Amino acid sequence: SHCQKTSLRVNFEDIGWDSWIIAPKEYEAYECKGGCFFPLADDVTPTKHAIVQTLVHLKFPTKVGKACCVPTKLSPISVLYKDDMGVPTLKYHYEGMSVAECGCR
Amino acid sequence: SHCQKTSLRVNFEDIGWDSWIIAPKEYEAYECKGGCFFPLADDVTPTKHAIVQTLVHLKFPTKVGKACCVPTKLSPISVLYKDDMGVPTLKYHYEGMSVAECGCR
Amino acid sequence: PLVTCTCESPHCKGPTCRGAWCTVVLVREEGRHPQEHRGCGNLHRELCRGRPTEFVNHYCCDSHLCNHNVSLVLE
Amino acid sequence: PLVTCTCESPHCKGPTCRGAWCTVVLVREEGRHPQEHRGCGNLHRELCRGRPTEFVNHYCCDSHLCNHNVSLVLEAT
Amino acid sequence: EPPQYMIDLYNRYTSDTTPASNIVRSFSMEDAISITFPFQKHILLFNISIPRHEQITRAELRLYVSCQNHSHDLKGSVVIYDVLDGTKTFLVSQDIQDEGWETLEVSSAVKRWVRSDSSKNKLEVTVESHRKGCDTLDISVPPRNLPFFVVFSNDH
Amino acid sequence: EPPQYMIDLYNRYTSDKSTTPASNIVRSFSHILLFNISIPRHEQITRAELRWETLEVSSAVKRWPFFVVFSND
Ligand SMILES: *[C@@H]1O[C@H](CO)[C@@H](O)[C@H](O)[C@H]1NC(C)=O
Ligand SMILES: *[C@@H]1O[C@H](CO)[C@@H](O)[C@H](O)[C@H]1NC(C)=O
């Protein structure tokens, strides 16, 4: 129930990307679930602004909100697809596809 | 109702930091309010994982959640304080104190 | 090279915008009525290559005001 | 220089941790019941210098297992 | 349908070794013209196109040679020229030892095609057979295993 | 209570918003006498001034009533 990285398997047929993505058919792109409750853990790596807004939120929960648990580092994957013209293209490092780390921001 | 930057005034007396922070007594540290609704705007600068998780969320809203509006760039401020030993120290760039930009991650 | 597109969307500041291409996107949340947007696109061209689903229909074109009168369907 | 601290918290992975200092934190959100955590601290030393409020009591110490039996209070005042 | 070579190349990328080429594209053949006495000659037309900001590291040409009424040593040879006007330019000359696919490096021709400062996207391939284990042999031309290009490039 | 020079140096940096001083860290440590001074390990010292007049005593502070020290990471 705290900010952590959870498993999420994305099947490209569900989002309609199976038309141009050749391989893989599905892959593991994680998700960051949980809340950012004070005290914020170190592995969350909170920023100074995240600490300030959290302490202020404790006093005014209705006016100010907590920091959010979001991906703080993204890992690339290899994918084989077709571009706009239909040329089969293979990229070894398709960046921004998988969650490396979570955190509170 | 969309991801944007809002004003938030932090008074260090409210969080108990008035004991060691000498100046300023309060300052403007913004907040990122609003939701990340598809289609995600360009000024939000969404990542590839944010788009995938959003598209997956549309099919399984109860299993997967939307992207979150968080600060994507932080600006420093100048502060004069006392450290653990009590030495009055002045830092010109106290980093991570103010929100420069928001985004969906 | 930027193209002028019809701008019918809450993010629009005026009736047209300029961007790398033009987009028409039809989104339907599970609980709400579907919505249709018209505007410019600049970042993720991969969305254009996807096939329409029961939730989203993301259409793109590269002509001047090509996104003006096109209508889309879902499923 | 690393110190071993008592770890009584949901964020704990085991009964003890190692960190730059030891912490005992008593937090009360404005609407909810108060909670108390015990663990290690490494990033934000400024929290140790803060004055206790009616919402948070952030206590730190630099000795081995110094955070084990210390007691804290909260007060509206 | 993409060539099986790209799929196998993908499975080689996933299995555990830091490839030197970040981008790999596959260009199929557009049209081919057969020429008919001493040997068998074809003229192949393509449409290679690479973004200018990328730098080419390698370019391959995949052909499929065989014959009817099929030694492990039948003597064949493929010679390839870059067509300019009607003059040619020598690229490679590869000895053939058995039937199947062949990989012929033609990086310089593709580099000239991309940075087209000078005709392009056309090359003539001649095939000869020598020994008696197979009288005549040629590349598979459209009447299944059509030829295609494979360009390796980095985004530098 | 801190000296008025630390507060004056604060108002000088925030007001202009373009001073861009050479060193981001400035500390203020409180006959012949001595004071107990501690600079961080990873940071590099820039300047030291025994302070009313100014004396560049930067040579001594590298090894060993408000002396001001200028340092940076
Ligand atoms: C063939 O190449 C030309 C460039 O010479 C390009 O404009 C054209 O789009 C290519 N053919 C196709 C079908 O894309
Ligand atoms: C300064 O004094 C404190 C205690 O008064 C001591 O802990 C500290 O080590 C002294 N500074 C140095 C550099 O030793």
Author numbering:
A (entry chain E), B (entry chain B): 325 to 429
C (entry chain A): 30 to 104
D (entry chain D): 30 to 106
E (entry chain F): 84 to 99, 102 to 121, 126 to 159, 163 to 178, 188 to 219, 222 to 246, 249 to 261
F (entry chain C): 84 to 113, 131 to 151, 202 to 214, 252 to 260
From the paper:
Bone morphogenetic proteins (BMPs) are dimeric transforming growth factor β (TGFβ) family cytokines, initiating cellular signalling by forming a complex with two copies of type I receptors and two copies of type II receptors, both of which are type I transmembrane proteins with an intracellular serine/threonine kinase domain. ALK1-mediated endothelial BMP9 and BMP10 signalling plays many important roles in angiogenesis and the maintenance of vascular quiescence. All TGFβ family ligands are synthesised as preproproteins, processed by furin-like proprotein convertase upon secretion.
To address this directly, we resolved the crystal structure of the human prodomain-bound BMP9 in complex with ALK1 (pro-BMP9:ALK1) to 3.3 Å, providing insight into the interaction of a prodomain-bound ligand with its high-affinity cognate receptor in the TGFβ superfamily. In the crystal structure of the pro-BMP9:ALK1 complex, we observed significant proteolysis of the prodomain. Our result is in agreement with Mi et al. that ALK1 binding only displace the α5-helix, not the entire prodomain from BMP9.
